[PDB]
Structure 1
Amino acid sequence: QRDIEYSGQFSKDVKLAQKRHKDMNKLKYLMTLLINNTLPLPAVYKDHPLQSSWKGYRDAHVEPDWILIYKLTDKLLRFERTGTQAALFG
Structure 2
Amino acid sequence: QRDIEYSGQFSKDVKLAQKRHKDMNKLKYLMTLLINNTLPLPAVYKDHPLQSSWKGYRDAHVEPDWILIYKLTDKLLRFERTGTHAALFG
Task: Name the TM-score class by shorter chain.
Answer: over 0.9
TM-score (structure 2 length as normaliser): 0.94
Deviation at 1:52, TM superposition (A): 2.6
- 1:32-79 deviations in Å (ceiling 9; x for gaps): 000000111010100000113555310000001000000111110000
Match of 1:62 in 2: 62
More divergent stretch after superposition (49-58 vs 28-37): 49-58
> Structure 1: 5+ residue runs without aligned partners?
none
- Classify 1:56/1:41 alpha carbon distance in 2 versus 1 (closer, same or farther; 3 Å): same
> Structure 2: 5+ residue runs without aligned partners?
none
Identical pairs, percent? 99
Match of 2:19 in 1: 19
Count of residues in correspondence between the two structures: 90
More divergent stretch after superposition (1-10 vs 23-32): 1-10
Aligned residues of 2:2 and 2:35 also touching (Cα < 8 A)? no
TM-score (structure 1 length as normaliser): 0.94
| Aligned equivalents of 1:53, 1:61: Cα separation in 2 | 21
CA RMSD of aligned residues (A): 1.2
